[PDB]
Design a protein around this ligand. Structure first.
Ligand SMILES: O[C@H]1CC[C@H](NCc2ccc3c(c2)Cc2c-3n[nH]c2-c2ccoc2)CC1
Length: 266
């Protein structure tokens, strides 16, 4: 079919260190895709991925010095824009998004991949508000030939990074992603970040370790999701709850949200 390979760049979706993310529309089919205009590790990692809660990779093309990544367009935008500052969002919406975030993270850890930069800016929503993990620019392989590799590279975003990354030379990959997921859960329920970074010098972090939950952001969060956050935001990564155990948590299994409203008559 002629012109089926032609895409029009209609608008700017985002901007990173690399460059830009553009919304591309097919000339014939009008199919919408996101084009990332920038790397070798990101493409190789994206080629491994296939899951309903992970942004799809369609292919890549290099036009000299410029690399074009063809990725899934998520019309719902960023999770970040669903969080109302200092309020959050309704608890059933947060629970549904956290379930979907957990499905994506289990998938990635199962194939030996750690994202290393989970935050609401990187969590995108489709037309049906389904959460999709995006941006594998900082991602790495932590398990190969069923052998775990300890990480030492400090990366991510300080309000979301686990305390071991700042204190220890080496650390396990999986508890690091679990921690950042608990900070996302905190942001969704209180509309604010608990600390600038998880260090003893940070007063807000010291208050948390001293269980001063009568202070913000903790006082805005119900006791059931707050009991889960007490298990996730644990300083020792060896004592920190694992995802199989998050799946058995009381709040995680609490019925709260109704399914998407279907048309009906009386
Ligand atoms: O002017 C406003 C509207 C445009 C913009 N919309 C935000 C936004 C809206 C949508 C998207 C993205 C961002 C990134 C993205 C989007 N869909 N897909 C991808 C993607 C990135 C990496 O892999 C895929 C905010 C400012």
């Amino acid at each position: 079919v002629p012109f089926v390979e032609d895409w029009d760049l209609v608008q700017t979706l985002g901007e990173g260190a690399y460059g830009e993310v553009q919304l591309a529309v097919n000339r014939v089919t009008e199919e919408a895709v996101a084009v990332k205009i920038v790397i070798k590790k990101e493409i190789c990692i994206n080629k491994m991925l296939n899951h309903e809660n992970v942004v799809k990779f369609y292919g890549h093309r290099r036009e000299g010095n410029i690399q074009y990544l063809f990725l899934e367009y998520c019309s719902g935008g960023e999770l970040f824009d669903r969080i109302e500052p200092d309020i959050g969002m309704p608890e059933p919406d947060a629970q549904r998004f956290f379930h979907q975030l957990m499905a994506g993270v289990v998938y990635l850890h199962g194939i030996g991949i750690t994202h290393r930069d989970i935050k609401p800016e990187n969590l995108l929503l489709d037309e049906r508000d389904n959460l999709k993990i995006s941006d594998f620019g900082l991602a790495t392989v932590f398990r190969y030939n069923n052998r775990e590799r300890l990480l030492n590279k400090m990366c991510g975003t300080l309000p979301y990074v686990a305390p071991e990354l700042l204190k220890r030379r080496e650390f396990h990959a999986e508890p690091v992603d679990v921690w950042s997921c608990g900070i996302v859960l905190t942001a969704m329920l209180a509309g604010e970040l608990p600390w600038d970074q998880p260090s003893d010098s940070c007063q807000e972090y010291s208050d948390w370790k001293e269980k001063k939950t009568y202070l913000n952001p903790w006082k805005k969060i119900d006791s059931a999701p707050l009991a889960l956050l007490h298990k996730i935001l644990v300083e020792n990564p060896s004592a920190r709850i694992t995802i199989p155990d998050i799946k058995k948590d009381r709040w995680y299994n609490k019925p709260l949200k109704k399914g998407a409203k279907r048309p009906r008559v009386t």
